[PDB]
Amino acid sequence: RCVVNRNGVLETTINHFFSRSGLVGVVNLTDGGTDTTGYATWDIDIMGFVQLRRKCEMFTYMRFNAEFTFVTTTKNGEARPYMLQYMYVPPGAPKPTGRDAFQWQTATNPSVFVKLTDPPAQVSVPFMSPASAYQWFYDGYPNNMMGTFAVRVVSREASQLKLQTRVYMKLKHVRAWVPRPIRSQPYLLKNFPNYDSSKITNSARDRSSIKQAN
Amino acid sequence: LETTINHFFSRSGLVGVVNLTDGGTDTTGYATWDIDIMGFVQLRRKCEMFTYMRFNAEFTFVTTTKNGEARPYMLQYMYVPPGAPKPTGRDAFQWQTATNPSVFVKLTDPPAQVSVPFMSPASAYQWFYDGYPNNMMGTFAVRVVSREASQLKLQTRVYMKLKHVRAWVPRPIRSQPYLLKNFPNYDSSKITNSARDRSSIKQAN
Amino acid sequence: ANIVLAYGEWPEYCPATAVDKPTRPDVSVNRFYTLDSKMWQENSTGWYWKFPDVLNKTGVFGQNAQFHYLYRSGFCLHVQCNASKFHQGALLVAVIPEFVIAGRGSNTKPNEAPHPGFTTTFPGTTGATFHDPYVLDSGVPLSQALIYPHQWINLRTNNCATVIVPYINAVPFDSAINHSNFGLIVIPVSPLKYSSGATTAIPITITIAPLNSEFGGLRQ
Amino acid sequence: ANIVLAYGEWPEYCPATAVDKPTRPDVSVNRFYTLDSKMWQENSTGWYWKFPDVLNKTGVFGQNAQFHYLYRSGFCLHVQCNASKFHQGALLVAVIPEFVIAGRGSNTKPNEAPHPGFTTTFPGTTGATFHDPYVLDSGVPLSQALIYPHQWINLRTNNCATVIVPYINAVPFDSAINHSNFGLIVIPVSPLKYSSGATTAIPITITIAPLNSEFGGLRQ
Amino acid sequence: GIPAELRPGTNQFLTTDDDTAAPILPGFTPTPTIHIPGEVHSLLELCRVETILEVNNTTEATGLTRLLIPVSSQNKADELCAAFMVDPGRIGPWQSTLVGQICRYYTQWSGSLKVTFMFTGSFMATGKMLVAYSPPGSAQPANRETAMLGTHVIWDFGLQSSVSLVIPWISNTTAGVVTLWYQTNYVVPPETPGEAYIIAMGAAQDNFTLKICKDTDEVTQQ
Amino acid sequence: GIPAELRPGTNQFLTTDDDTAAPILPGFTPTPTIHIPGEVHSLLELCRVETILEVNNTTEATGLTRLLIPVSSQNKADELCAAFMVDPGRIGPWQSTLVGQICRYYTQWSGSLKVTFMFTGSFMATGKMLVAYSPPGSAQPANRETAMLGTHVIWDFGLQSSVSLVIPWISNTTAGVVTLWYQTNYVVPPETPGEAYIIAMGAAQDNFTLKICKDTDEVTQQ
Amino acid sequence: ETAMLGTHVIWDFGLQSSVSLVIPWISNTTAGVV
Amino acid sequence: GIPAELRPGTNQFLTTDDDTAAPILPGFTPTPTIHIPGEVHSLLELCR
């Protein structure tokens, strides 16, 4: 066709640019026998996947609330009605060390008790930074930002299933400051913007001549 | 009230049938379904009555098994907007893409229900395009959320309802049968008469 | 004379968000482009024309419609059919928005089924004749083709018809080469009859006035 | 002269809940600290400076910034590049908040990958040259580095640039030793050219004015 | 935390329910509408359009010539030119018209009709015709003087060229017969064909209303 | 105890639903905000910034010299300095710019553009250049007198040092070609290099608007 | 179709019986073809 | 009989939820309070 009309001005705001329920982490649970693993923790970092990391390294400062949705499946896929405990560990509180340790019975670690046959779990985490905004680019010399996230199967004895949880993160109420360019070189590490000195990828694919329209 | 265009189109009707298998060696896993309201020949005859149309859609997803029993497995429905690439595998990266809105619902749950707005770059849809220039509404995929592979074959029914429909430039109702899906090709030989025959012109048969 | 206004609206200008203002000739394009006469006979079937590629080879309108990119105009059609007082018959003249010519065949495979050529979809300034006028060459019966703006040319009442048709499209601007907007159809519902010694063929003359034309995006 | 104001805000004082009022010198720190000239040549790559540790060894500002604990100030940068009328080339001068120098290597293991040293992250009063100016030594292309406050120093139009930059940080007070706030980058996008017999190198001079300085927590 | 109860009808998916759904794209604004001429609001605007009836639907007829009533001069006089019913939703001449195709989607209809005739013939040829409506309950009339006692218009070719016959009232629950008789004769001067045609058209009125929607059966495939 | 029913859509987790959730920490107040300069509100503020295009994206080129258009004096006259497209969301010179990287997240864009040229050369060297926009539908012009009939600016080096060419309208649905021709010649006095460069930059306008968000494909890994 | 682009009148025999074509301007100093 | 839908978060037991519960004893009035000196309202009074 030929789009002569003007488009919409609501899909370009920062709040719309970030607010959408996206997949952010995948946690594997085993709940074994001899090898007493039992639990499976997952530190909160939005830089996990390379799809939101490229969108959040576009800005220097950000400020947002988060909504976490927990979708737990089994190995084959069937959902038997077992009780599950999700636990949010605030920044500074110690991580749980065992399946039946005393960090699970601690009252100041907010837990969610939900079954496999239930709708998936959904919690909201507020702005929990000591500064006024988050910042991924810290130029200088000085651990943890948002909190740890554990999960176990509530039972007296030990179950014989292995689970597989998906932590879907949605952002809300996001504000940004000091935009910066979009990174073209591929990633090498998780917490560092290291590129490769050899094999610098050009940000524009090649053509034959400068006097053409390829 | 039953003769308005809005009442003439708004009703929850069956529009598509999707077969899922979730096999072993033959890793099919998923099953996509492009959105086209011209699928069945019952709404195609009602929408080729008008030249321009404008409507929102409600999609209801009723998934059964082969025998009929509903075991509590998690299901992912995924809407692919026009321009976004279709998923190529059961565990590809088009499923984890955040801008493809998904619905997580079980077999034992009530059937799924979503609403899709007017997503055309023009001011109205048009099936009759006289001229020379792919996709209009979006693709629709579905898979079974699981780490390993399940051993069931599903069968989903996509029931479409229209809402907020508006029409422009009416045109006559097609009497010849259909031959293709995207083209109004009739048959030159064996032209069916639009009025069944009688004996004489001077009777009341 | 009776003037049928297509859908009760007059062709008017565009009230678009383009800073490049679309040009308006008003002088050399608002003239009566007269097509050649069609020789209607006893065994005739009908004729159809695709308008934004009927006048793409003719004069100032064709030059300013081929070398531009955006196009919007209405039309004033005027069809004479001058016959004697001893001839008899009837014509049906009607405009059809988005008149898609179908293909005639009995094949259901996608790239095996027949499709109309370029000289069948876009006839040009000489028009094209129907193969099956009972289904309008589209699988749609002509008995209910009176839903369109139309007139009857009955050879015992009058000899002329006129249709003022506005711009019917979903987008207010469109390419005048890659998209035919609407078609004109004349069909001899009642055939032509005459006694021996009369003129064996009746001419049909069509004149077109491009009311309220707008062009945009001038290029080479 | 054209003055570019960084993000449209002027450096102003803090309106914090500390009873110990932060001191304001206003006399011996609001003077033009002039750095040494950089010798720009044909095969040059660029230069970058980290500001709150550029002036930590120089005079009253360095003494009052090393022996304090809390720091907040804006800056007035002024860069001359005086060349003849027969030289040609172009410079891009731009400030970048939180300019993190990346490490160059092809290792994905955590404590095996290379990291920049102390003389690369914090150059001091003598600056440091880029290794790959196409990616700003950060994996980010310089073609879209115009999103920052910036000027062009074109050797056929002018010879000077000036940038008034306020305090950009999430916390209104910060240590002036353990955290470099923002960096200055000059890059020869267009190289230097000159006929034989001219001066083979062009000097670049930078002067800094610490506007609206505030210090807190005096200690030994 | 309000107390609540779930009544029968819970978790069912009713077809014709008027219930909202959560949108897939939030904040997505569509393309703004423009003024496209020719907007339809109800189907009564598609029923009121005149439409050629296929009254010559008998056999040994080609494609187009099924739309024409033949008239000739070697037809004696006081004869029967043609006859047809006045029942839209039924197999017959009212199947090719638009009101018949529209009234097949709905199972009840009511109101008045209008059948308009038009004579396609020479200018110099005159003659009278007797168009006659016979209301439901009566069979087809056998003579012309029996037809002139029912509803009738004596329509001549000289003055009028297109007569119109209003059908007072037809319901859905024999349905009434429109006959067309040869009042005088088809007189014709020399050097002029004594063979012409009549196009019959038909439409609904402002009284025409429909109720109880349903799918059609013109489509055979699925 | 009010009666209620559960309709379809119950217990489903829609991705793009705008639904509240129970907070983990109640009564927790976060750190109060301060005035951090440089707040962005929409992405149209990131599209309106001038950005160096990579017009020299051909091969045998180093890292930085891909951003420069070469100009010399041994180039005869009325020749073709350079040519490039005006389509942000596509592989080409508009891939290194910021409006091209932003318009790849969204699948539709509309509005006008602005391409600003800047001559990096000596002060004593003058000469004219013919910058020429050719709207969509046309191929690249072959001669300079064919280009001077389209959209054109005759930009000299003496008076002006940075010309700007406004692109009237581009849609997403060949896309139009910006050519740069050698109007007169690159004249140069002695003791001055006869080799200079042109930096090309490009940005959007207030007319530029985007619709239908989607993920990008610059990232290969997952 | 080349002639219908210049100056033209489509004159029918039924309605009109005598058409008139105005010649805009001719000088004395090929001269134009009807 | 109002229509309703159940969203995610249904049937979960959040720890720090501020949600009411049905009382075991209805109409039970407790013992009325008296003025006991030395009431604390916040922990900042114990830090000073």
CB contact under 8 Å between C86 and E120, yes or no, is: no
**Pick from F165, F209, F97, C179: nearest CA to A3:** F209
**Pick from A177, A168, A194, A195: nearest CA to A133:** A177
Rg (CA), chain F: 25
> Which element (helix H / strand E) includes D119?
helix D118-121
Name which of B99, B104, B147 is nearest A164 (Cβ-Cβ).
Answer: B147
d(CA C148, nearest CA chain B) in Å: 7
Interface with C, mutate which of B51, B123, B130 (most C CBs under 10 A): B130
Name which of B123, B132, B172 is nearest C144 (Cβ-Cβ).
Answer: B172
- Contact of chains B and E by CB distance (3 or more pairs under 8 angstroms): yes
Contact partners for chain G, using 3 or more CB pairs closer than 8 A, are C
CA A61 remoteness from chain centre: 18
**Cα D37 to Cα D81: distance, rounded to the nearest angstrom:** 9
**DSSP 3-state assignment of A154?**
coil
Q: Where are the domains of chain C?
A: 1-220
User: What range defines the domain where residue F93 resides?
Assistant: 1-222
**Cα F73 to Cα F16: distance, rounded to the nearest angstrom:** 59
User: How many angstroms separate the first and last alpha carbons of chain C?
Assistant: 43
User: How many angstroms separate the first and last alpha carbons of chain G?
Assistant: 15
Task: Count Cα neighbours of A146 within 13 Å in the Cβ-side half-sphere.
Answer: 22
Which residues of F fall below an 8 Å CB-CB distance to E? 1-10, 14, 16-18, 211-212
Cβ atoms D4, D205 nearer than 8 A: no
**Pick from E46, E161, E154, G17: nearest CA to C152:** E161
d(CA E15, nearest CA chain F) in Å: 11
Cβ atoms A9, F42 nearer than 8 A: yes
Which residues of H fall below an 8 Å CB-CB distance to F? 1-10, 14, 16-18
Cβ atoms D189, D130 nearer than 8 A: no
Q: 3-state DSSP helix/strand/coil percent for chain H, to nearest 5?
A: 10, 10, 80
Kindly state the tokens that stand for A19. Answer: 């607010």
CA D55 remoteness from chain centre: 11
- Max CA-CA distance within chain G? 40
Cα distances (Å, whole numbers) of residue F212 to A207, C186, D188: 30, 45, 39
Rg (CA), chain D: 19
Amino acid making up residue D144: Q
Rg (CA), chain H: 20
Ramachandran class of E137: left when φ > 0, alpha when ψ lies in -120 to 50, beta otherwise: left
Which residues of E fall below an 8 Å CB-CB distance to F? 2-7, 9-11, 13, 17, 19, 21-26, 28-29
Give the pairing type, strands F2-6 and H2-4: parallel
**Cα F215 to Cα F195: distance, rounded to the nearest angstrom:** 43
CB neighbourhood size of H8 (10 A): 24
Cβ atoms E23, B115 nearer than 8 A: yes
Contacts of F1 in chain H (CB under 8 A): none
d(CA C100, nearest CA chain A) in Å: 18
Cα distances (Å, whole numbers) of residue C40 to B117, D68, E120: 50, 104, 16
CB contact under 8 Å between F137 and C69, yes or no, is: yes
Kindly state the tokens that stand for A172. Answer: 């809300």
Sign of CA dihedral C70, C74, C75, C76: negative
Query: Which residues have CB under 8 Å from D117's CB, separation 6+?
Result: none
- Contact of chains G and F by CB distance (3 or more pairs under 8 angstroms): no
Cβ atoms B123, C170 nearer than 8 A: yes
CA D72 remoteness from chain centre: 16
Amino acid making up residue D169: N
Contacts of F13 in chain B (CB under 8 A): 103-105
Backbone angles phi, psi at C52, to 5 degrees: -70, 5
**Cα C112 to Cα C107: distance, rounded to the nearest angstrom:** 7
Our count of domains for chain F comes to 1
Name which of D50, D100, D183 is nearest A193 (Cβ-Cβ).
Answer: D100
Cβ atoms A142, A87 nearer than 8 A: no
Q: 3-state DSSP helix/strand/coil percent for chain C, to nearest 5?
A: 10, 30, 55
CB neighbourhood size of E28 (10 A): 20
Kindly state the tokens that stand for E53. Answer: 């009836």
Kindly state the tokens that stand for D72. Answer: 């907040």
**DSSP 3-state assignment of B12?**
coil
CB contact under 8 Å between F49 and D146, yes or no, is: yes
CB contact under 8 Å between F14 and B99, yes or no, is: no
Q: Where are the beta strands (DSSP E) in chain B?
A: 13-19, 50-64, 74-80, 102-106, 112-116, 125-126, 139-144, 155-170
CB contact under 8 Å between C144 and E96, yes or no, is: yes
For residues C6-21, one letter each, b for 16 or more C-beta atoms within 10 angstroms of the residue's C-beta and e for the rest, the string is bbebebeebebebeee
Cα distances (Å, whole numbers) of residue F98 to E156, F168, F170: 80, 19, 17
Query: Which alpha helices (H) appear in D129-182, and where do they start and end?
Result: none
Length of chain B: 205
**DSSP 3-state assignment of E82?**
strand
Cβ atoms A101, A94 nearer than 8 A: no
CB contact under 8 Å between F2 and E3, yes or no, is: yes
Ramachandran class of A11: left when φ > 0, alpha when ψ lies in -120 to 50, beta otherwise: alpha
Rg (CA), chain C: 19
CB contact under 8 Å between C219 and F138, yes or no, is: yes
**Cα B182 to Cα B180: distance, rounded to the nearest angstrom:** 6
Q: Measured between CB atoms, does B78 come within 8 Å of chain A? A: no
Cβ atoms H6, F8 nearer than 8 A: no
Amino acid making up residue B50: F
CB contact under 8 Å between C132 and B191, yes or no, is: yes
Length of chain C: 220
